[PDB]
């Protein structure tokens, strides 16, 4: 009977909420009310990079902290050196509408995807010295939003057909499918130890997944509209989310609920990208009013503004040693800040 | 959590009148634009009426002009629809709908593909 | 020291105190205004290089402003050097540069006009940036050099290149070098006039009078239709305001440009007022 | 040095190739095609030729008077469209195709047009509006079994504008009906009264051989308006 | 019978997620503060470095 099942679901949800309320004895503000502020944080552009002909959708830093990749809505994928502002590679694409990029931890491969529902894996170290397409992965029933490597042989993807997948590159086939969302899936982030990951999915819900088994572990709620970005805290025990209600929030995985919210009364636009700093004290967010903001993760205050762009800001990244911060917008320029 | 819940419905003879109410929980009520939709036996999802944040902009469909009225209370968080002079071609299931974003004047909220911010619905039957 | 002697073969002295004062403040304001313009065109250069059209338009406007400022300062220099002692030295050199730079001004305006027509008639067309810049700079600063040097070489040895009482070109019953400025100026207005008509054919689509008036009020300072009033200063004596309307209108050229060319724009105003705020 | 010269050489070669690509990119016009299931955008695509499973997008290319056109159709996607629709904020034009022989699938078309008109990322984009199935409308109106007044009451108080231009050899009833249907869309278009983009309406059929020329002329007008706005003459 | 199966799956999932060991919020807050204070003298975007060791200037 449908009604009996729905009533049982409602009862279980009430039990969940009562157990969750019973586990909150204090707030983050009260504990963190006896520390020192970080003060005004000022940054300047050190390098500016040119060459694209249309808007940019994604960037990704390398593991040596010197090279980076970038993808634009005109069918090109460029690999740059940021110490000298040179160009090391330029690759043309087959479909221009591209929405994601990734850079393998060993420096050998790159990947991309978009509105053609296909993931393309490119080789960068051929014997002849020329870039050629090494593999194409097909089987999704909607466009691809993000993709991130694990090693040179395994890769995880998320699409707007409500599902996520894990792929074996050499054979060419799927190996585990993650299903259970309701709307589209917009972002994902991998754990530092590469045994779990988190997904945000455009129905005001977030989920944590276990790679080696294929089931869900926890779900978190609290936002009021679509979730657009996600990332892990450096120790793998927290994560931050941003949405289109103009709010960021922080979630913890052991207490299983929400701790702190970042908002203001003058902010009436959405959020496009989030990222942490090396120690976990600075949280950097990108907005649709042409500039980026810098928050303090324990006091819930604002500490800085980065404001040099002309159009919507779309991508943001911090290196693996803390040195530089790179941002990219819809006017076809990247910028590097320190 | 986002919750929309409906109340009022049932069986009415032709020429009757009745009133449908909807209660909302989990978001700021006044930043949003709201709509009514309905499903008839053997058809798709239609559109009936819509109202804006303050209440000064209202719009209807062709076949309900002169009979149905839309109302919005912000202090008590409620959406109302008043139904007069029913016809047998109004028997259906009725849902309320919220737009996906705040501070905006467009919608994309009739889809069958399990649109998230929609209620469960109430049944209205008009027969002798 | 009237501003009308550029086009005037002969001036009636009855109105002498009427004219001078206008000039000697007019030019003044212009200089200041033009300076401001240049600064702005260098401050926002990275935020205005979007498409080809904005690029070419900005090139033409900055060149017009620069040339006007230089010619004005030379007019001041040559308006306060006495020829009662030195019949040569400065009062020849100054003459030359005055001529040159005024000619440059006019030719740049012609470029702007032609460009606009190329943006209405042939809508599906494209050329390289560098070819356009090359042709523009070779026929904008190129023809004035030829005309100036030929004039000075062909006239100076016989010594009929300067007037007697003021430092500017002469003409009296013999060699008439003044035509080497009046002919190549008027016959650019006659081109630009035609261009204006074309634009009003595309804007009279149907409150329309407001749109057409504002459209006619932005092009007149830049394409230089005011200078046409000198056609009566060459062919009259006093009439009404032939020696005073010309001064008042043509002296305020840079002020008009700064009032309409940059401040009445939409995007640049937003960027400037955001930077200021 | 002796290992930095090669880097500059590679950068120079890459920049040369990028210039050759920019030339080709900036001379092609990109259009987006939108419609519904009962419309005939498939037939319009099939007639615009000479003038992998689970594939997500389709492309078609044609040439009119030595100008190139690219046109994009959306294939295997879900029903919701509020995320990918943003990838089209810089196309020259949208082409909206509507069937006009239903009387009960027209309100949905009106709502979809009204939603495209007012979106934040598509307020500088112009629309070319096609209304297919004119023969069916003519037959249905002359037959007289179905009445438009059951769905749109205002048709009971409508008269053809006296300055109309009916096609020769046409019953006045068909003129009344089709002019009413056109007025609905134009009223929505001019309701905002902004003046930064325009609607261009037309009437077409199943086998007609003039659509590409119509698109050509309308795109010409769009680009002229853009150029004039660049010069502040508006 | 899609609705019945969907409801069964939802109920099984909620039963699977309703019995999980949890801790207080004070412990999580303490751990976050301690981690932040352990790695605070090596964070170059919060404690800047001299210009002779910066690779970007």
Numbering used by the authors:
A (entry chain B): 3 to 340
B (entry chain N): 1 to 128
C (entry chain R): 567 to 772, 784 to 854
D (entry chain A): 13 to 63, 202 to 253, 264 to 394
E (entry chain G): 6 to 62
What do the authors say?
The global resolutions for the Gq, Gs, Gi, G12 and G13 complex are 2.85 Å, 2.84 Å, 3.09 Å, 2.8 Å and 2.66 Å respectively based on the gold standard of Fourier Shell Correlation (FSC) = 0.143 criterion. Since the Gq-coupled receptor has the best density map, we use the Gq-coupled receptor to study the stalk peptide/receptor interaction. The stalk peptide adopts twofold helix into the orthosteric ligand binding pocket formed by TM1,2,3,5,6,7 and ECL1,2,3. The ligand binding pocket is highly hydrophobic. Aromatic residue W8046.53, F7475.39, Y6683.40, F8237.42, F6412.64, W734ECL2, W737ECL2 form the bottom and the “barrel” of the ligand binding pocket, and hydrophobic residues L7445.36, I8116.60, L5931.47, V5851.39, V732ECL2 fill in the gap between those aromatic residues. We also find polar residues T5891.43, T8106.59, R729ECL2, and H8207.39 on the rim of the ligand binding pocket of GPR110. On the stalk peptide side, the aromatic F569stalk and hydrophobic L572stalk and M573 stalk, acts like three legs, insert deep into the hydrophobic cavity of the ligand binding pocket, make extensive hydrophobic interaction with surrounding aromatic or hydrophobic residue F6412.67, W734ECL2, F7475.39, W8046.53, Y6683.40, F8237.42, particularly F569stalk forms a π-π interaction with F6412.64. In positon −5, all the 5 G-proteins have a polar residue. Based on the above observation, we classify G-protein engagements into 2 major classes, Class I, Gαq/Gαs engagement; Class II, Gαi/Gα12/Gα13. The Y at position −4 of Gαq and Gαs all point to the gap between TM3 and TM2, surrounding by R6232.46, L6823.54, L6813.53 and R6853.57. The tyrosine at −4 position and glutamate or asparagine at the −3 positon enable polar interaction with receptor, for instance N−3 of Gαq interact with D8428.47, and E−3 of Gαs interact with S8438.48.
GPR110, also known as ADGRF1, is an aGPCR that plays a key role in neurite growth and synaptogenesis in the cortical neurons. A general activation mechanism of aGPCR involves the removal of the GAIN domain through an autoproteolysis process which generates a short peptide called stalk peptide right before the transmembrane domain, then the stalk peptide inserts into the ligand binding pocket of the receptor and activates receptor in model called “self-activation by tethered agonist”. In this work, we report cryo-EM structures of GPR110 in complex with Gq, Gs, Gi, G12 and G13 and systematically compare all major G-protein couplings in one receptor which revealed undisclosed information of G-protein coupling. The global structures of the GPR110/G-protein complexes resemble most of class A GPCR/G-protein complex, in which the G protein use the αH5 of Gα to engage the intracellular cavity of receptor.
